[PDB]
Symmetry: D3
Subunit: 282 residues, 6 copies
C-alpha cells in the first residue's frame, strides 16, 4: 500500500521546512507519495486560504490519506483559517507549529485536528536593521542543527511514520492523529542518547532555543526603540548559535562512544535502527 | 506592480530549499507573490512531470511572470523532463541546480532557460547505513551555514531580485534570464567581505563543500563494498561540518570589525545595504 | 578620609562572593577599610541572625559607614531576618541578592534599605546526586566568568564606589543607597563594549545565565522524580558553561580591537579608565 | 555531634575563597557549623591581626574545634603574625597558602600548625595598568576552574573532612593536622580520573598554573619598565585561561566515558561517591 | 646486523622532512645508521645532481643498503635526474614524492626504483605576496599534524622498517622495494583507529589535504592576476589548517577511549605496539 | 655574489629542522646556495664527528662562507665535539641549540663560535612507552607552529639573512657571528604583532613551550617509576599542544585586523615586508 499526503507550508519554521523530507531521506521509499504546496513565507489569511485551496484542489485527484499544515503560530489569523478549512474537510489533518500554538491546543482537539507543537522552534529576530536573507538563513542553519542533533526531528519522524502505517490500513481516525508538544523535557522520555551528558547538553540546547523565542518577541513586538531592539534581536541569534554548538557537542560525545543512533527507512517504509558505525541498520 | 513566480521543488538542494525565502526574509515585501509546489524528495520523471503539471495548472489562474525549478542534477532524467516542459511553456523559467548541471549548460541555453548552478551545493552521503533523517538534516544545516555565511545565498538573492525588477517592467526576455555558475572563485568578483581573511576562509569553505560532492559520488555510485563506502560517505559529512566551521569563522571576523554586510529588502522590494551593526539599511 | 564597611555573607551568590574584592583589586586603596563576616553557605534564620550579630558587635568598635548583606534570595526567611535587623540598626545598609529578591523590592524600599539584585546570578543545580563540591566550584567558575566578562561586576563596582564617595562626605542618606536591578538589558544603557557584537554576545550570556535559574528551580523544587531532576539540574550547568563561553567570546572580540575597558582604582580610590592595552589608566 | 570551625580570610587565593564552601556544598550538613571572618583583600600585619582577633573574639562563645587561616604567602609579614597568634592560641589551626609558603613549612611544623600549600594557586598579574576588578574576577574564574576540574579541590575537601571527623571524637592532636603540599604530581597518587588522558591534561593544567606564578612574580616584583611588565603580567593571564581550557577538556573526557567522579556529603557529613551520572552516591 | 641508508633531500615535502626520523624516534636503535644529505629547498637539475653525487661519494665508504631520494614531484626535471642516476647506480633506491609523481609511476617501476607517493603531501601556496618563511613553516606544521595524526607517517614507517629488515638478511631485491601510493582510502585497509569516527575524520583531513594541491597549483601555475591568485593560495592554507584540526579531533577521540595506537621501536629495531596509555609496548 | 653555507643536523630541534628552509622559502633566491648533511637523530660523539667530517670534506670543494651546526644541547658530548672541530676549522660557524646550551655560552664565545639558543625549542617526552614515531611527529608539528606563529622563526631568519649579507662582502669576522638567546621576552623587543593581545598570547605560548622542557627532563632523566614518568612526559606533550593553540589564536587576531606580518625574500635575497593581505611586499 502507498500512503499519500499533502504538506502545506505557509511561513517558515525549522520543523515545517524539513517535515516531509524526514520521512524519505534517500527518496527510496516505495510506500509513500507526497505533494508539497504553499505560499512561501507569507501567512496572512488570504495567502493561507490560497495555499489550502491549492491543496484541496490537488486532493480531488491525488486523494491523500492525510494533510499536514505547517508554519508559525497556529493561533494567528492565517493559520486559524487553515485549521478551519482543514477541520471542515474530509481529510485527516495535522498542524505543525511552535509554542504560540499552545494557546489553541484545546481548540485544535475540538476541531478534530492533530498537532505537533515544537517549543524550541523559536521565532527569529525579524527586524529589518538586522534580518537580511543571509542572517535568516544562518539562523535557520543553527536551528536545524539544534532540532536535528538533539533528537527533536526523530520525534517528528516517528509521529508521522506511525500515522503513515495507520494510513496503510485505511481510515485513520481522530484517535490516531498526533497530539504532541515537544520541548527540553521530551528528551527525558526517550532513549536518544547512550551518553547521559550528550542528553543533558541536548536538553540545554533545547532550553536555550526555546528561550530565544521570548527574546525575539521582546525585540520584535514589545521594544520600540531601535537602539534597544536591534541589539535584543541580534542577542537571540547569538543564543541560537550556541544552542547549535551544544547540539554539536552532544553528537560528538555519541561519536566518541560509537553510539550515534541512526533510524533510516527501508524501501518498504520500515524504520530500521542502529548505534554502531559499522552495524547494519535493522 | 507585483511580480509573481512559481517555485517547483523536486529532490533537495541547499539552494532550492531556501531560494524563495531569500527573497522575502520578513514576509513584508508588497511587490512579490509566490507559489511553491513539489513532490518532496522524489525526482524521477513521473514525479517531476506531476510537479511541473501542478505548477502549470496553478499558472493558468496565477499568471506568474516566471517559474523556477530547483533540485539536484539538471542532467538527470526527471530534471531533464522539467527543463523541456518548462522550455516549451509560455513562461520564462530558471533552473537551480548543482555541479552535475554543467553537463547540460549549453542545452539549457539552447532551450532558452536561465540557470543558477551552485557547485558547493554538494550531494550528501546517501547510503542507508549512514544517512537517516537526522543525519540528512545535520548535513543540510552545515551546508546552509556554508551557503549563507560565504555569501553564496546573496549571489542568488541578487540574481532573482534583478529578474523580479525586470518582471515588473514586464518584458522578461531570454536575455534577462540568469546564467550563473557559482563556486569558490565567485567570491573574487564580489565585495562580500571587508576582511580579506574572512574572504579566503569563505573560499576555503566553498572549495571544501565542492569537494564533498566527489566523495559522496565515490561513496554512493562507485564503491560497492560497504566496509569501504560507509566510511567514505561519513567522511564527506565530516568535511562539510568543517566547511561550516570555516564559514562561521569568516562571519565572526566580519563581526570583529563591525563590518557584516546586510542587504535586507524594503517593503517595496528595494534591496538595502549596511555594514555597521547600528547603521540603518539604505 | 577612610570609608569603612562591613560585608555579611550568608549563603553564596557569584556577586556576594566577589563584592568586597571588586572594590580593592590590588589591595592598594588607602581610602577604604573592610571587615567581612559570615556563616559560610548556611542562611537559615538562626545562622543569619548570628551573622548579623557578629557584624553589629564588630560595628560598635569598627564604626562602619555602611553594611552590606549578600547572598541568595532576599525574600527567604534567613535574609528577611537580616533585612529586619539591618533596617532597625543605625547603619545604612545594602542588600545584594538575585532575581527572587524582586518579590521584596518594595518592602526593601519601605525598610530604607539599598539593593542590588542581579538576575543572572542564578541558583545552581543543588541536588545531592549531581552537585558535589567540585561541581559547585565549576559552576561558580563559569558564573564568575559571565558576571565579570559581561560587565556586570563593573556595574556593582560602580554602585559601591559611588556609595563610598558619599560615605567620605559623611551624609549617607537613604537617597544615596543603590537601588539596582541588573539583567541582560542593563548592557543597553552602558558603554562597556566598543564592539556591538561583543555587547550582544554578552547580552546573550546574561540571558542564558538568567534562564539557568528557572531550570535549577524546576529541578530542585518542582520535579520530584530523580530520573528527571538529575538531568534537569545538569542541563542548567551545561547552559552556564556556554554562557561563560559567550562571555569569553565577547572579551576576545574586544581584545581583537585593542579596546578592553579597564577601570582600576588609584591608591586614593579614584576610579581610572583605559581602553588601549598600553594606555595608562587615567 | 557538630564540628565547629572558624575560617579567617585575608587577601585572596582560589583555595581560600572556596575552602569553607567545599565542605557543605548544598548547606544540608547537620554535623558542621562555620563562622568566617576576614579583612577582605588586605593582609598587612595590622589587618591580619584584626582578623585573627575577630576570630578569637568569636571563639570564646563559639567554641570551635579548629581555626583555619587562608590567604597568600604564609611567609609574608601579615600571615606570619597570624601563624604566631594561632600557634600561641589554644585552638588547633591549619594554614592554607600557596608556593611561597614552602619557605616557612618547617617553621609551621615547629609552631604546631597544619598546612595545605597549593602550588598551582598562582599569584595574578597585579599591575594597575592591567588588573582592574573585572580582570581580577576573570583570572579568579579561570583559576577556580583549574583547581576544581583538576581535582585539587577534592584533595582539599578530603583533608578537611578527615579533620572534621577527628574533631567529632574531640581528639584533634598536632598529628591529626594536615601537612599537604599540592602540585601537578599530586594527581599521580590519586584515583581522580578514569581516563589517563584526562589525568595528563589535568596535570598539564596544574603545571601551567604553577608556572603562572613565576611570570606574575617577574612582572610584579622584578621587571620595572611598564613596556615590559604590562605584557608580562597579561601573558600570565592568557596562560591561566589556557590552563582552564585544559582542565575543562579533561572534565569533558570524563563525561564522554560517563566516569565523572562526584563525592558529595550526606546530611550526616559522610562523604559519598559515584562515577555514573544516573547512579546514586554511596 | 646494522642496516645503513642514505637519505637525499632536495626541495621539501612533509614526508621527506620527517622520513628518516620516523625510523629512530628516540635515537636508541642499535640496528640502523643513516646519513642525510641535500641541497635544502633547491631541486633544479644542477642542485639535484650535486646532491646525488654527495650521496654516492659518501656511499663509497659508507656502503649503504639502500638510498632514499625525497622531495616534490618525481616527474620534474631535477627529480628525474635523481631517478636516472639512482637507477643506474649499484644501490637499491626508493623515491619519496607527492601526487604529481603518479605521472612517472610506471617509469619508476621500469627503472627498478621503489616509491612512496603521498597524495595528501600537498604543494603549498608559493607566491611571494603570501608565502614568507613564517607562513611556509605554519603550513608545514599543519601538514605534519595531518600526516602524523591520520596515520600516514605510520604507513611510511612500516614500509621502511620492512625494507630495513630485508637489508639485514643480506639481499634487497627489486621485489622488496616499496611501491606505495597513499591517500584518504589508504586508511580503509588499516586498523589505525579504534573509533570509526576518528577514522572518518582522519579520512576527511586527508581528502582536504589532497584537495589543497589543486588550489595551490591553480594559484601558482594557472591564475596570473595577483588580485585573484593571492586569495587563492591563501585559501589553500586555510584548508590545510582545518585538515589539521580534523586530524587533531580524530586523535582526541582515540584519547577518549584510551585507544591511541603507539608503535615504538625497541633498541634492536623491533616495532612494538600498544593501545592503552599505561600498557607496556610489546 | 652567491653566499654559500653548509648546515649540519644531528639530533632534532624545531629550529634545526627548519633553519635552512626559512632562508629560501620559495627556492627562488639567486644569491644563496646550501648544502645540508647529517646523521639523522643520532648525536653521540662518533656520529657527530662523522657529520662534521662530511661537512668539512664537502667544504673543500664547496667553499662555504659559514657553517651551521644545529641540534639539541650544545653542552652534550656529541655537540661539544662539533664545536671543537668547527672552532678549529677555517670556517666561521654558528651553533643552533636549546636552553641547555646556556651552560656553554661563554665557552662558545671563547671558541669564536656564533650561537642561536632557542629556549622554547623544548625537549620532548622521550620514553618508549609514550613516544613512538607518530607522537614524535605530532609534537614537532605543535612546536613548529609555536616557533613559527610566535615570530621566533623570523628572529632566526633575520639573524642568518644578516650573516649572509656580510658573507657577500667577504668579511665574516667573529664580531659578525650571531649571539642570540631567544625566549618569551624576545618578543618585547620586536614589532612582530600589531595587536598587543596577539603578542601576549604569543608570549604565553613561548613560556609554556619553555616550561615543557623541565617536565620532559623530569620525566626522562629524574623520575624512574614508569607509573609516574609516562604521565609526566605525556603531560609535557599536552602543554605543547596548548602552546600551539595560543600561537594559532595570536595569528588569527592578526588576521582579524589584516595585519599579518610577512617578510618574504626577493630573488636577489632582499627581505621584503608587508602587513596588509593585498599589499605587495616591499
Ligand atoms: C522567513 C523567516 N524565516 C523563519 N525561519 C524560521 N525558522 N523561523 C522564523 O521565525 C522565521 N521567520 C519569522 N518571520 C517573521 C517576520 C516578521 C515578523 C514581524 C516583525 O518582527 C514585526 O513586524 C516588526 O515590528 C517589524 O519591524 C519593522 O519596524 C522596524 C522599523 O520600521 P520603519 O523604519 O519604522 O518602517 C523595522 O525593524 C521593520 O522590520 C515576525 C516574524 C519571517 C517571515 C520568517
Ligand atoms: C533528501 C536528501 N536531502 C538532500 N539535501 C541536500 N541538500 N543535498 C542532497 O544531496 C540531498 N539528498 C540527496 N539524495 C540522494 C538519494 C539517493 C542517492 C542515490 C543512492 O546513493 C544510491 O542509490 C545508493 O547506491 C543507495 O545504496 C543502497 O545500497 C546499499 C545496500 O543496500 P541493499 O540493502 O543491498 O539494497 C545501501 O546503502 C542503500 O542505500 C543520491 C542522492 C536525497 C534524495 C537527498
Ligand atoms: C554552596 C552553593 N553555592 C552556590 N553558588 C552560587 N553562585 N549560587 C548558588 O546558588 C549556590 N548554591 C545554592 N545552594 C542551594 C542548596 C540547596 C538548595 C535547595 C535544594 O535544591 C532542595 O532542598 C532539594 O529539594 C534537596 O535535594 C535533596 O533531595 C534529594 C534526596 O532525596 P531523598 O533521598 O528523597 O531525601 C537529593 O537530591 C538532596 O540533595 C538550594 C540552593 C547552595 C547552598 C549554594
Ligand atoms: C584581589 C586580588 N585577588 C587575587 N586572587 C587570586 N586568586 N590570586 C591573587 O594573587 C590575587 N591577588 C593578589 N594581589 C596582589 C596585589 C598586589 C601585589 C603587589 C604588586 O604587584 C606590586 O605592589 C606592584 O609593584 C605594584 O605595582 C604598582 O606600580 C606600578 C606603577 O604605578 P605608578 O604610576 O608608578 O604608581 C603600577 O602597576 C602599580 O600597580 C601582589 C598581589 C591582590 C590583592 C589579590
Ligand atoms: C620551501 C617550501 N616548502 C614546502 N614544504 C612543503 N611541505 N610542501 C611544499 O610544497 C613546499 N614548498 C614548495 N615550493 C615551491 C616554490 C615555488 C613554486 C612555484 C611558484 O609558485 C611559481 O614559480 C610562481 O609562479 C612564483 O610566482 C612569482 O610571481 C609573482 C611575482 O610576479 P612578477 O611581479 O610578475 O614577478 C610572485 O608570486 C612570485 O612568487 C612551487 C613550489 C617551495 C620551494 C617549498
Ligand atoms: C627524534 C626526536 N625528535 C625531537 N624533535 C624535537 N623537536 N625535539 C626533541 O627533543 C626531539 N627528540 C629528543 N630525543 C631524545 C631521545 C632520548 C632522550 C633520552 C631518553 O629520555 C632517556 O635515555 C630515557 O631514560 C630512555 O628511557 C628508556 O627507559 C625505559 C625502559 O625501561 P626498562 O623497562 O628499564 O627498559 C623506556 O622508557 C626507554 O625509553 C632524550 C631526547 C629524540 C632523539 C628526538
Ligand atoms: Ca523558444
Ligand atoms: Ca597590632
Ligand atoms: Na537503541
Amino acid at each position: 500500500t502507498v500512503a499519500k499526503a499533502i504538506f502545506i507550508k505557509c511561513g517558515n519554521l525549522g520543523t515545517s521546512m524539513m517535515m516531509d523530507m524526514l520521512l524519505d531521506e534517500r527518496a527510496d521509499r516505495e510506500d509513500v507519495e507526497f505533494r508539497v504546496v504553499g505560499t512561501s513565507v507569507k501567512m496572512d489569511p488570504e495567502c493561507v486560504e490560497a495555499a489550502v485551496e491549492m491543496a484541496l484542489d490537488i486532493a480531488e485527484d491525488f486523494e491523500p490519506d492525510f494533510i499536514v499544515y505547517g508554519g508559525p503560530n497556529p493561533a494567528a489569523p492565517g493559520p486559524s483559517k487553515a485549521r478551519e478549512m482543514l477541520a471542515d474537510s474530509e481529510y485527516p489533518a495535522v498542524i505543525i507549529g511552535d509554542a504560540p500554538g499552545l494557546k489553541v491546543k484545546d481548540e485544535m482537539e475540538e476541531q478534530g485536528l492533530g498537532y505537533i507543537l515544537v517549543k524550541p522552534d523559536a521565532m527569529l529576530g525579524a527586524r529589518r536593521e538586522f534580518l537580511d536573507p543571509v542572517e535568516m538563513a544562518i539562523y535557520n542553519a543553527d536551528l536545524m542543527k539544534v532540532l536535528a542533533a538533539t533528537g527533536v526531528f526523530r520525534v517528528v519522524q516517528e509521529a508521522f511514520d506511525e500515522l503513515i502505517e495507520k494510513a496503510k490500513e485505511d481510515e485513520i481516525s481522530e484517535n490516531d492523529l498526533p497530539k504532541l508538544v515537544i520541548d527540553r523535557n521530551t528528551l527525558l522520555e526517550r532513549e536518544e542518547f547512550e551518553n547521559p551528558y550528550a542528553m543533558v547538553k541536548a536538553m540545554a540546547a533545547l532550553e536555550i532555543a526555546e528561550n530565544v523565542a521570548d527574546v525575539s518577541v521582546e525585540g520584535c513586538f514589545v521594544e520600540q526603540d531601535k537602539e534597544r531592539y536591534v541589539p535584543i534581536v541580534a542577542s537571540a541569534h547569538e543564543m541560537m548559535r550556541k544552542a547549535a554548538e551544544l547540539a554539536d557537542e552532544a553528537r560528538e560525545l555519541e561519536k566518541s562512544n560509537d553510539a550515534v543512533l541512526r533510524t533510516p527507512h527501508a524501501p518498504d517504509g520500515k524504520v530500521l535502527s542502529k548505534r554502531k558505525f559499522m552495524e547494519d541498520p535493522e
